[PDB]
Amino acid sequence: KTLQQIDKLICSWLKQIDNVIPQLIMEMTTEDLVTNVDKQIQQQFQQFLATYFPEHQLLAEEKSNAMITNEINHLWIMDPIDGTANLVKQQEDYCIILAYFYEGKPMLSYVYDYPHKKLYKAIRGEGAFCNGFKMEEPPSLKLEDAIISFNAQVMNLDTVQDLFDASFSYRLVGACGLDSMRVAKGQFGAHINTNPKPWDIAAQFLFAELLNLKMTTLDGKAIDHLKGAPFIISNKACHETVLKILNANGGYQKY
Amino acid sequence: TDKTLQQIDKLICSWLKQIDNVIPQLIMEMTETKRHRFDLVTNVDKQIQQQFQQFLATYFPEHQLLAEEKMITNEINHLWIMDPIDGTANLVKQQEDYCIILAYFYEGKPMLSYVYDYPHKKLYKAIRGEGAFCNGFKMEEPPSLKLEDAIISFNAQVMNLDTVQDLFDASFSYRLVGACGLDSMRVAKGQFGAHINTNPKPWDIAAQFLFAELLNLKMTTLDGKAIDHLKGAPFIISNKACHETVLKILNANGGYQKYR
Numbered sequence: 001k002t003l004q005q006i007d008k009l010i011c012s013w014l015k016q017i018d019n020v021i022p023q024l025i026m027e028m029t030t031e032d033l034v035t036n037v038d039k040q041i042q043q044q045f046q047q048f049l050a051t052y053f054p055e056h057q058l059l060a061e062e063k064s065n066a067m068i069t070n071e072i073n074h075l076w077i078m079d080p081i082d083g084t085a086n087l088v089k090q091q092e093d094y095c096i097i098l099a100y101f102y103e104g105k106p107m108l109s110y111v112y113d114y115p116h117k118k119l120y121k122a123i124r125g126e127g128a129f130c131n132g133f134k135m136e137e138p139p140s141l142k143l144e145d146a147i148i149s150f151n152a153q154v155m156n157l158d159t160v161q162d163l164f165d166a167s168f169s170y171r172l173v174g175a176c177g178l179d180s181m182r183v184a185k186g187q188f189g190a191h192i193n194t195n196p197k198p199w200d201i202a203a204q205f206l207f208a209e210l211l212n213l214k215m216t217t218l219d220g221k222a223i224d225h226l227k228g229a230p231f232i233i234s235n236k237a238c239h240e241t242v243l244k245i246l247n248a249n250g251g252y253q254k255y
Numbered sequence: 256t257d258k259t260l261q262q263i264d265k266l267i268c269s270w271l272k273q274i275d276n277v278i279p280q281l282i283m284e285m286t287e288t289k290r291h292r293f294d295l296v297t298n299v300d301k302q303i304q305q306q307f308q309q310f311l312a313t314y315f316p317e318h319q320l321l322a323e324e325k326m327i328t329n330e331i332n333h334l335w336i337m338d339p340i341d342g343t344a345n346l347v348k349q350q351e352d353y354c355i356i357l358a359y360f361y362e363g364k365p366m367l368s369y370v371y372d373y374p375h376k377k378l379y380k381a382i383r384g385e386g387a388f389c390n391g392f393k394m395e396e397p398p399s400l401k402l403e404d405a406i407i408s409f410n411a412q413v414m415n416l417d418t419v420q421d422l423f424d425a426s427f428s429y430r431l432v433g434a435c436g437l438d439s440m441r442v443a444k445g446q447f448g449a450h451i452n453t454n455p456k457p458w459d460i461a462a463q464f465l466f467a468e469l470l471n472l473k474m475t476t477l478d479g480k481a482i483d484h485l486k487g488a489p490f491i492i493s494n495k496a497c498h499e500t501v502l503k504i505l506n507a508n509g510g511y512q513k514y515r
């Protein structure tokens with residue numbers, strides 16, 4: 001019922017999920033990738049919800065979501081594995097993403113970096129935490145002093161060049177959730193994804209609010225958690241400059 | 256010589272273990288915040304290096320050190336190459352994704368190599384006669400990776416963009432950890448197909464020789480030649496199945512260099 005109660009349940013389900021994943025990985029089979037691991041984690045969470053919060057609905061990657069509307073009171077958004085490519089190719093640098101919305105308002109968020117056993121969580125009224133230790137607003141980062149992260153394969157190269165020249169350096173973890181959390185931790189100045197699904201960014205809203213980060217569309221607007229949009233999550237001090245570079249000279253999209 | 260590889264290895268491992276007692280403090284000191292990529296400090300680099308110099312004074316006093324933060328005979332018997340922090344930018348900006356690199360050469364022959372991923376407490380080591388290990392578990396030759404099925408890693412800011420584009424189109428995807436030692440180990444583990452560094456120093460690649468030999472990796476110049484461990488050269492470390500294709504792309508259409 002309370003946020004703490006729901007949080008305690010989710011944290012224990014995530015803990016138990018450590019006991020399932022090594023096996024799924026040992027038998028890993030695959031099919032824009034999708035494994036058994038994605039599907040099984042998702043199904044288990046569906047069953048978890050049937051069992052504890054049976055009014056609650058799920059918007060997730062591996063299910064049809066036709067039934068999900070503007071007015072659902074209790075909504076979870078899930079990415080059961082974000083970074084499937086990294087899971088398959090590296091068995092590292094992937095995460096589980098969850099977010100609970102109450103009447104459209106972010107209340108709980110989770111990014112579980114399972115390979116490193118690092119649970120990032122955010123709780124409206126309490127704050128954000130990594131394995132329990134409170135996260136603080138990161139230091140201010142101007143773009144020239146910041147590392148930035150984005151997919152350079154989906155942008156035109158003049159714009160990529162401008163991002164390179166204006167920033168301290170460039171890195172890529174390769175999972176939206178984890179690259180986002182590096183912004184949250186102050187390790188990156190900003191992460192960009194030019195075409196995310198609602199589940200790629202759903203947890204990030206509450207993190208951005210509680211840690212004073214900017215999270216907007218690439219036009220600087222509020223994002224609908226129900227609909228993807230081109231997006232950025234950014235340190236407050238470099239947000240404007242990134243958007244200016246992205247939108248200059250007819251924009252960032254490949255010619 | 257005189258000490259066996261096991262004896263030397265034991266001492267390096269115990270030094271590296273005591274280094275866990277030093278690093279948290281060095282990091283606690285150290286916040287800025289306006290020097291660019293090329294102009295970084297730190298005291299962490301310098302202190303780790305000084306301590307290793309004391310370690311050698313103390314145990315292997317014949318041994319010499321070629322290191323970043325500090326060569327008169329061509330033919331040194333006992334040589335260590337060190338990068339006390341590889342990934343200084345990541346240390347400063349992220350406090351993650353950096354490593355300590357050490358490589359011992361006996362009469363110019365790689366005998367011991369270490370890449371210590373300290374933030375994750377993962378010690379990658381290679382020992383001539385034993386094999387390569389991660390925290391003790393033996394590393395095997397990685398599966399074959401064709402370039403189209405492989406993640407590759409390189410600095411995209413230092414190559415011309417057409418060649419960067421060609422590398423994107425031909426590989427499965429692109430990632431960057433941002434420390435030569437760690438990006439290289441991802442090749443060693445089979446996580447990446449290849450890592451490129453177009454201008455490394457001897458310390459950036461010194462450990463990698465022995466890893467590439469023991470795990471059947473290709474490590475060459477970008478012209479496909481053997482590298483002198485004493486002298487940097489533009490380099491690639493690669494899975495055997497994607498090495499040729501990477502070099503072909505890099506050298507195609509007049510080459511990879513940005514301002515040519």
Ligand SMILES: O=P([O-])([O-])O[C@@H]1[C@H](O)[C@H](O)[C@H](O)[C@H](O)[C@H]1O
Pocket residue numbers: 032033079081082083084085151174175176177193195196200
């Ligand atoms: O497919 P998936 O691994 O869940 O999600 C992807 C990752 O977050 C990745 O970093 C990329 O940028 C894509 O935009 C996402 O679709």
Ligand SMILES: O=P([O-])([O-])O[C@@H]1[C@H](O)[C@H](O)[C@H](O)[C@H](O)[C@H]1O
Pocket residue numbers: 338340341342343344410433434435436452454455459
């Ligand atoms: O300065 P440092 O962090 O020891 O070493 C650097 C890192 O390995 C980095 O990834 C980069 O590619 C440079 O080539 C190196 O100079």
Ligand SMILES: [Ca+2]
Pocket residue numbers: 038061079080081082083084
């Ligand atoms: Ca996914």
Ligand SMILES: [Ca+2]
Pocket residue numbers: 079081082083176199200
């Ligand atoms: Ca995703």
Ligand SMILES: [Ca+2]
Pocket residue numbers: 300323338339340341342343
């Ligand atoms: Ca260094």
Ligand SMILES: [Ca+2]
Pocket residue numbers: 338340341342435458459
């Ligand atoms: Ca280095």
Ligand SMILES: [Cl-]
Pocket residue numbers: 141142143144237238239241
């Ligand atoms: Cl700025």
Ligand SMILES: [Cl-]
Pocket residue numbers: 400401402403496497498500
């Ligand atoms: Cl190939």
